[PDB]
Amino acid sequence: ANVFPRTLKWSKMNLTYRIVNYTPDMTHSEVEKAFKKAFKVWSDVTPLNFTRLHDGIADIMISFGIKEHGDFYPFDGPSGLLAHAFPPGPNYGGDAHFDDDETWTSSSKGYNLFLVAAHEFGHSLGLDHSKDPGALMFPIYTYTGKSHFMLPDDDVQGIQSLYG
Numbered sequence: 001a002n003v004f005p006r007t008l009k010w011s012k013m014n015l016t017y018r019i020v021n022y023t024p025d026m027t028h029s030e031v032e033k034a035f036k037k038a039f040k041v042w043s044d045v046t047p048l049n050f051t052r053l054h055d056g057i058a059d060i061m062i063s064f065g066i067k068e069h070g071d072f073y074p075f076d077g078p079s080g081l082l083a084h085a086f087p088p089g090p091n092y093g094g095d096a097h098f099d100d101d102e103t104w105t106s107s108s109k110g111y112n113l114f115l116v117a118a119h120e121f122g123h124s125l126g127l128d129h130s131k132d133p134g135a136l137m138f139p140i141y142t143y144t145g146k147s148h149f150m151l152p153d154d155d156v157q158g159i160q161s162l163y164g
């Protein structure tokens with residue numbers, strides 16, 4: 001007899017990602033900057049490292065889409081669902097999809113791409129939603145303007161339980 005494979009954590013510390021396409025709301029550079037910083041949230045507290053591929057197959061494929069966009073978990077237009085992501089594994093594992101019916105920003109206005117991406121890459125690395133309202137992995141958006149960013153303790157303990 002056999003059981004289904006997966007799912008736990010990446011068996012490798014050097015992971016790749018690809019920005020498959022881009023939102024109109026921010027420049028290529030601003031989007032690239034936001035995702036790089038979002039990955040740095042996680043590499044700053046684990047031995048993980050992330051490299052960007054410009055084409056082809058990466059561990060974490062990042063894309064923007066609307067409504068039904070190729071996984072039968074359709075987005076819903078402006079508001080509501082902002083994004084979703086899949087835990088470590090083959091094919092779709094690690095991938096992160098952002099709803100391009102939202103207004104994405106580098107500010108306290110609209111929805112901050114960096115912060116939402118940071119949350120989603122938590123999923124990409126194997127974290128489900130936290131019940132701690134102060135956690136990055138809490139499923140309610142409450143990002144504010146100032147000042148710097150610190151990964152809350154709940155998320156630090158969660159990610160470090162997987163990757164040390």
Ligand SMILES: COCCN1CCC(C(=O)NO)(S(=O)(=O)c2ccc(OCCCn3nnc(-c4ccc(OC(F)(F)F)cc4)n3)cc2)CC1
Nearest residue numbers: 080081082083084119135136138139140141142143149150
């Ligand atoms: C029933 O099934 C539906 C399930 N549903 C759940 C919701 C969604 C989801 O989670 N997808 O993955 S979402 O897309 O609506 C969605 C996506 C992303 C979200 O970001 C959550 C982030 C929570 N946070 N806010 N601020 C902060 C924050 C943390 C630290 C910090 O530094 C500090 F502390 F100041 F120093 C500053 C701010 N942390 C929220 C919602 C969709 C799927």
Ligand SMILES: [Ca+2]
Nearest residue numbers: 077079081099
């Ligand atoms: Ca939406």
Ligand SMILES: [Ca+2]
Nearest residue numbers: 059091092093
């Ligand atoms: Ca993949």
Ligand SMILES: [Zn+2]
Nearest residue numbers: 069071073097
């Ligand atoms: Zn999707």
Ligand SMILES: [Zn+2]
Nearest residue numbers: 119123129139
């Ligand atoms: Zn989530």
